[PDB]
């Protein structure tokens, strides 16, 4: 069809079989880089806006405010532009020029915060802006907004179901907000009724899901796997649908993403390397020899040109 605006064009991302990972083609990847603003977050950018419209929290002339300049910030920026909303994004002044320019190109009102305060400063500035005129501004809150996992339940999950003819046995997904693994798992287990294995992936450097489920001290840590490992259990992570948690280290995530490019011709981001490293480990267990493993690849390589990936 013809999409009325770019937000409606989200999803329908392809599945590609891996040749150099898994065993006898049991690993398949879903390429979320193929989206209106080139990441998985495009889906949630669209649906959080759409849900806010439907429930009347977002109306003509209201302005979107947030403190993300990662994938969600970019997603919200294209959606705001596509649907005629003003948007302010707060970010620490030490963020890259490439990111400032991208966000400015998408028509965002960028508010740079104190380098010394990091993300906390940007989040406070955003919260402050909203507090100043609550009726003018709306903050969509990706970590708790149910419209996040809902879009994955309505689109991402059903796409996996349909493109595999229901043969999917395992879903492997890195956890940032938890929305992807939550929505996809609820779709396949509840709407389609199939008892798959849902595998959350997190950094070995910040393995808070692992620690939580073991009843151990929760000790977040720094890592390089952008987009995952938030260091807390987000509200949009439904632990009741998680079967297994795999930890992956930053270096192996990076090396794996490099292999995806050089050996498969897949321009994957860092967290995609992490998800595949986790999937490859399960795929080489005799228990998953005859199991179809589907892995979410959240983003695309060129967004990482200035990073350790290259």
């Amino acid at each position: 069809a013809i999409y009325a605006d770019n937000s409606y064009s989200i999803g329908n991302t392809p599945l590609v079989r891996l040749k150099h990972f898994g065993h006898n083609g049991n690993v398949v990847v879903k390429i979320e880089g193929r989206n209106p603003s080139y990441s998985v977050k495009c889906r949630i950018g669209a649906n959080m806006v759409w849900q806010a419209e439907k429930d009347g929290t977002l109306t003509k002339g209201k302005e979107i405010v947030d403190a993300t300049s990662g994938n969600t910030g970019i997603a919200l920026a294209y959606v705001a532009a596509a649907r005629g909303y003003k948007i302010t994004l707060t970010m620490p002044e030490t963020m890259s020029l490439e990111r400032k320019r991208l966000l400015c190109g998408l028509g965002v009102n960028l508010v740079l915060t104190e380098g010394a305060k990091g993300m906390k400063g940007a989040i406070a500035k955003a919260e402050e802006i909203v507090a100043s005129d609550p009726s003018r501004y709306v903050m969509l809150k990706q970590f708790e907004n149910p419209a996040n996992p809902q879009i994955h339940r309505e689109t991402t999950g059903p796409e996996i179901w349909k493109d595999t003819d229901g043969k999917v046995d395992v879903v492997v997904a890195g956890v940032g907000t938890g929305g992807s693994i939550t929505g996809i798992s609820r779709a396949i287990k509840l709407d389609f009724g199939k008892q798959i294995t849902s595998v959350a992936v997190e950094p070995v450097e910040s393995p808070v899901i692992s620690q939580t489920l073991a009843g151990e001290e929760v000790k977040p840590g720094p890592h390089k796997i952008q987009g995952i490992g938030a260091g807390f259990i987000p509200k949009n992570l439904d632990l009741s649908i998680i079967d297994r948690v795999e930890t992956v280290d930053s270096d192996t995530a990076l090396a794996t993403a490099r292999r995806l490019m050089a050996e498969e011709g897949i321009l994957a981001g860092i967290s995609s390397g992490a998800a595949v490293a986790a999937a490859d480990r399960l795929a080489k267990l005799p228990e998953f020899a005859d199991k179809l493993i589907v892995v979410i690849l959240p983003s695309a390589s060129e967004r990482y040109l200035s990073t350790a990936l290259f």
Binding site: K41, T68, S69, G70, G73, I123, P220, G227, G229, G231
Partner: peptide, 4 residues
């Protein structure tokens, strides 16, 4: 790490 919260910049997602």
């Amino acid at each position: 790490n919260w910049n997602i």
